[PDB]
Amino acid sequence: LTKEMKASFIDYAMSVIVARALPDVRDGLKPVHRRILYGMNELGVTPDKPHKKSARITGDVMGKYHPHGDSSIYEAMVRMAQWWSYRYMLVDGHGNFGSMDGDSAAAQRYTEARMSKIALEMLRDINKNTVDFVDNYDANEREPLVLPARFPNLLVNGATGIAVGMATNIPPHNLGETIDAVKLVMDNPEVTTKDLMEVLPGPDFPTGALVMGKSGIHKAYETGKGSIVLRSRTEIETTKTGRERIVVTEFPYMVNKTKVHEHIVRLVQEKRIEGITAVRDESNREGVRFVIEVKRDASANVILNNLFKMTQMQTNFGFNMLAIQNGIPKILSLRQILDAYIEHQKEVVVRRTRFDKEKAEARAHILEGLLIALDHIDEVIRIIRASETDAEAQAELMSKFKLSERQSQAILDMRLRRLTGLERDKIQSEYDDLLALIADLADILAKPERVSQIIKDELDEVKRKFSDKRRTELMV
Amino acid sequence: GNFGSMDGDSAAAQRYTEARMSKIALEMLRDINKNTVDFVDNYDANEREPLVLPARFPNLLVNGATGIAVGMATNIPPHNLGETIDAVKLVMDNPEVTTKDLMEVLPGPDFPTGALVMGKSGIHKAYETGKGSIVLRSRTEIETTKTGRERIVVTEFPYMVNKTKVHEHIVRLVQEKRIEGITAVRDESNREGVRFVIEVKRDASANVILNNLFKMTQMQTNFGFNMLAIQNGIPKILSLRQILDAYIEHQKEVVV
Amino acid sequence: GNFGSMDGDSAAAQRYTEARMSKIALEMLRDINKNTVDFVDNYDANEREPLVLPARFPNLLVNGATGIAVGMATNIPPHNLGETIDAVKLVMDNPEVTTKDLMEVLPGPDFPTGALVMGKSGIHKAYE
DNA sequence: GAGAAGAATCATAATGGGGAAGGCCATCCAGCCTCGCGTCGCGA
DNA sequence: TCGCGACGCGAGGCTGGATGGCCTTCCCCATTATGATTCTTCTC
Numbered sequence: 048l049t050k051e052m053k054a055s056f057i058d059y060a061m062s063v064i065v066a067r068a069l070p071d072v073r074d075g076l077k078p079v080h081r082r083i084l085y086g087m088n089e090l091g092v093t094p095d096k097p098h099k100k101s102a103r104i105t106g107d108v109m110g111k112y113h114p115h116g117d118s119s120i121y122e123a124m125v126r127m128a129q130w131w132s133y134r135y136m137l138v139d140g141h142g143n144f145g146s147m148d149g150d151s152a153a154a155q156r157y158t159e160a161r162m163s164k165i166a167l168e169m170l171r172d173i174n175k176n177t178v179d180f181v182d183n184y185d186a187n188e189r190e191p192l193v194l195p196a197r198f199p200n201l202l203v204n205g206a207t208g209i210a211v212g213m214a215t216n217i218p219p220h221n222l223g224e225t226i227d228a229v230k231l232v233m234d235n236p237e238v239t240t241k242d243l244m245e246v247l248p249g250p251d252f253p254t255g256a257l258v259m260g261k262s263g264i265h266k267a268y269e270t271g272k273g274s275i276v277l278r279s280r281t282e283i284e285t286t287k288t289g290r291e292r293i294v295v296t297e298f299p300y301m302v303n304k305t306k307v308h309e310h311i312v313r314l315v316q317e318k319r320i321e322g323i324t325a326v327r328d329e330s331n332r333e334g335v336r337f338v339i340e341v342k343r344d345a346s347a348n349v350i351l352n353n354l355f356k357m358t359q360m361q362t363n364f365g366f367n368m369l370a371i372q373n374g375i376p377k378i379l380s381l382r383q384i385l386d387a388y389i390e391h392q393k394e395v396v397v398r399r400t401r402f403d404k405e406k407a408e409a410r411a412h413i414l415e416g417l418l419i420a421l422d423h424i425d426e427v428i429r430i431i432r433a434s435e436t437d438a439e440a441q442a443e444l445m446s447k448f449k450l451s452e453r454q455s456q457a458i459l460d461m462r463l464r465r466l467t468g469l470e471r472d473k474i475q476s477e478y479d480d481l482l483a484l485i486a487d488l489a490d491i492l493a494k495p496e497r498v499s500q501i502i503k504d505e506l507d508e509v510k511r512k513f514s515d516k517r518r519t520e521l522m523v
Numbered sequence: 524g525n526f527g528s529m530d531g532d533s534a535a536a537q538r539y540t541e542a543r544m545s546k547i548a549l550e551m552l553r554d555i556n557k558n559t560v561d562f563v564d565n566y567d568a569n570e571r572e573p574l575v576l577p578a579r580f581p582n583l584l585v586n587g588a589t590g591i592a593v594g595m596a597t598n599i600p601p602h603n604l605g606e607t608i609d610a611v612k613l614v615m616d617n618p619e620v621t622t623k624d625l626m627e628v629l630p631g632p633d634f635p636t637g638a639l640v641m642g643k644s645g646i647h648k649a650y651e652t653g654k655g656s657i658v659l660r661s662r663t664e665i666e667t668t669k670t671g672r673e674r675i676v677v678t679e680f681p682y683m684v685n686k687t688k689v690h691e692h693i694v695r696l697v698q699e700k701r702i703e704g705i706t707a708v709r710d711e712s713n714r715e716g717v718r719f720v721i722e723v724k725r726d727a728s729a730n731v732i733l734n735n736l737f738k739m740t741q742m743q744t745n746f747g748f749n750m751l752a753i754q755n756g757i758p759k760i761l762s763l764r765q766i767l768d769a770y771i772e773h774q775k776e777v778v779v
Numbered sequence: 780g781n782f783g784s785m786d787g788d789s790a791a792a793q794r795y796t797e798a799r800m801s802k803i804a805l806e807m808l809r810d811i812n813k814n815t816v817d818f819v820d821n822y823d824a825n826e827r828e829p830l831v832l833p834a835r836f837p838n839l840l841v842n843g844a845t846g847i848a849v850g851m852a853t854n855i856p857p858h859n860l861g862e863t864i865d866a867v868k869l870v871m872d873n874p875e876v877t878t879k880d881l882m883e884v885l886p887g888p889d890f891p892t893g894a895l896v897m898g899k900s901g902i903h904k905a906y907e
Numbered sequence: 908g909a910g911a912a913g914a915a916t917c918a919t920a921a922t923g924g925g926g927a928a929g930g931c932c933a934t935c936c937a938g939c940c941t942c943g944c945g946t947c948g949c950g951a
Numbered sequence: 952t953c954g955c956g957a958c959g960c961g962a963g964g965c966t967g968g969a970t971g972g973c974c975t976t977c978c979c980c981a982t983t984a985t986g987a988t989t990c991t992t993c994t995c
Binding site (some may be wrong): 116118119120121122125126151209383 | 821822823825826862
Binding site (some may be wrong): 935 | 952953954955957958959960961962963964965966967968969970971972973974975976977978979980981982983984985986987988989990991992993994995
């Protein structure tokens with residue numbers, strides 16, 4: 048009764064939290080977005096072909112699952128097109144998406160998008176039985192609960208959760224810095240937090256800010272709790288008539304210019320400094336030109352500290368930094384993200400190795416049958432002439448030599464083009480090649496460090512392909 | 524008009540009662556000139572009514588009977604007609620044949636839906652003495668999808684079965700929590716051909732579930748016989764020979 | 780379309796779902812320009828949804844409610860509207876009236892079929 | 908004268924049959940995915 | 952040279968939604984019988 052009500056409470060709370068709160072540690076990818084990328088990979092249409100303008104994709108998404116609104120699925124599409132909010136990059140698109148401005152793109156299917164470049168190598172190896180699957184409620188198609196990865200996007204894109212019990216802030220980071228962190232933890236299981244300070248000088252943004260504190264960053268990467276400073280960029284230049292002109296490019300994150308400017312107008316117009324009727328905040332299609340000019344007989348820095356007291360040019364940005372794994376939430380630190388991603392990639396690589404051994408040893412068994420057929424042929428021909436049935440021919444071949452049923456029938460699959468001797472040598476050559484590759488994979492399976500070397504290989508692949516610098520200029 | 528197909532809705536539109544007959548009464552009876560049957564008189568005892576229905580045909584042997592709750596119970600289970608004609612004509616040209624050699628001519632007792640029959644000991648008992656229940660199963664198959672999921676697909680059922688009452692009993696078995704694996708209980712497009720599908724998740728041993736169907740559910744049929752005859756008022760009981768014997772001597776008197 | 784009148788046949792023709800509304804929402808709510816109610820945002824937290832339904836009208840007091848099996852049970856039995864308007868306006872112009880003198884204004888709890896009501900002790904208990 | 912009761916005549920209502928309007932069901936059309944087959948590639 | 956296997960492309964088939972045709976139910980109209988009221992009839 049009340050225990051069953053508690054069971055309903057527990058199970059339904061798990062349903063809501065695993066539905067729309069923080070995703071798994073293993074991916075950092077929410078299942079809405081997971082199914083977006085899975086169905087867009089299963090569109091099959093390459094990003095090389097010009098990216099499409101349709102709600103047919105989202106119609107197949109809603110055929111895959113019924114939410115409490117596919118407008119929310121389109122919101123997920125658009126929020127993954129928010130490069131100014133969520134970093135590089137998940138949408139190859141063309142249509143209206145705006146900026147961090149207060150933009151409303153009601154043109155839903157009229158936007159264009161398809162697969163993105165990072166998604167291509169990000170979600171390979173589906174054909175290698177790497178990830179498990181579950182059936183939908185529609186009992187017709189399957190879906191994976193997690194994904195294979197080529198980086199911890201956990202660190203690449205942060206989290207802005209909701210307070211089902213409590214929300215979660217997770218800051219973004221840099222590509223190559225994360226690669227160096229992976230290499231560091233790979234080479235040493237004995238790293239420190241100063242090591243993390245080295246390979247990660249600090250969390251960054253697609254826009255940029257200033258984070259002056261140090262021990263808040265320290266408690267952030269250790270305890271998982273703490274708040275930081277997000278500060279706008281400040282440039283003090285000289286007006287030709289003597290005004291301390293303020294140029295602003297960076298901002299605190301999730302801070303529109305519009306309502307901040309309106310409250311600045313209000314604070315001017317509530318019996319305060321009114322001679323600052325100089326707000327040249329435009330031309331922001333080349334960058335950000337947020338320029339004011341402080342009036343005469345007034346210093347810029349006092350108005351700067353007053354707008355920092357307005358909590359919009361300098362903001363205490365907190366961090367909750369929680370996660371979901373094994374059905375439980377967790378307070379975060381590193382060597383957890385790190386070791387989790389490491390052992391996940393270990394799973395992926397080793398299971399890929401097992402599947403490749405499956406294909407290779409199956410084809411090796413085939414070429415065994417091929418070479419044993421191509422040893423002695425004409426006696427088999429003449430005994431086939433003493434038969435009239437492929438079942439009789441199968442029994443004859445079982446009397447002749449040791450084969451499989453598949454092997455016997457594949458040897459039956461031989462026209463007269465198969466009756467040469469050069470192709471015997473070719474099958475023998477690829478047979479020895481395949482045996483060498485099988486022995487290579489077996490020796491790799493008897494090698495722990497070789498897995499890490501393959502991880503280094505894929506890291507160097509994506510590092511030659513792409514890199515990124517710290518656009519977020521942070522002084523401490 | 525309006526009847527209801529086979530699912531518990533006997534449509535009784537007495538206003539819409541518009542019909543004809545079939546062409547088999549032309550084989551049944553033609554006694555216009557035929558001095559056959561006595562008559563009984565009704566309205567101040569004037570107008571005829573025949574005693575019996577003579578024929579040239581043991582069709583209504585093969586039809587089946589429903590006379591149960593009056594005193595004791597009896598019925599007539601049905602066969603089909605062709606091998607009936609065969610075995611009858613063999614008795615005609617050969618008046619000294621045996622039973623089981625005509626069981627070589629006679630298949631099992633038939634049903635219009637098309638029933639799976641197993642066992643012949645009850646056949647041995649009931650062709651002789653007309654008593655006993657036999658086991659009957661529905662044409663039921665396991666079918667694989669494009670995904671590898673399995674499906675229990677039935678085609679028909681044995682005699683006196685509702686789709687819908689058994690469907691409610693399936694929904695019971697769901698909420699009774701005494702059977703597992705079952706996911707979809709669906710039924711569509713049934714008027715081009717009867718198609719009811721149960722669909723079950725993987726890792727469930729679906730053939731064991733079919734065994735559980737034909738153990739506990741009403742899909743299994745224990746169909747019993749009772750052919751306790753009446754020959755000129757007094758109650759009797761007949762073998763399959765004696766029925767056709769009385770038929771023979773009736774045809775004798777008919778044609779004479 | 781197809782509904783079933785009052786005898787246990789809830790006709791659910793989802794294909795035939797063709798309708799309009801009534802003219803009473805024009806009395807219910809007109810908050811276009813009317814700064815009344817906070818909003819909550821849904822699809823990646825964007826689009827509005829109002830918290831409550833303001834009105835000028837206690838009509839839905841007089842409608843009746845069905846909220847039972849969630850925690851504990853409750854309902855709202857219905858009245859009619861005219862003497863409701865009467866007793867309300869009497870409380871409006873007279874903020875210090877008594878209960879039973881408005882029971883003089885208020886008849887029994889009403890029903891759409893038309894019910895024979897006997898007794899008033901339960902009326903005395905349930906209006907309180 | 909006067910008063911009451913009975914038979915006959917007129918009007919009203921109900922039953923059945925036929926006509927018309929709208930609703931539900933099946934069929935077809937197009938789009939997308941899967942299978943098979945052909946061209947290419949590898950080895951002696 | 953020669954043979955087999957694998958990937959990509961085209962064609963076919965199936966599903967859902969919309970549209971049209973025909974069937975059934977209710978209402979109305981006329982005919983016939985019953986009830987009531989009026990005129991005539993009876994007795995001191």
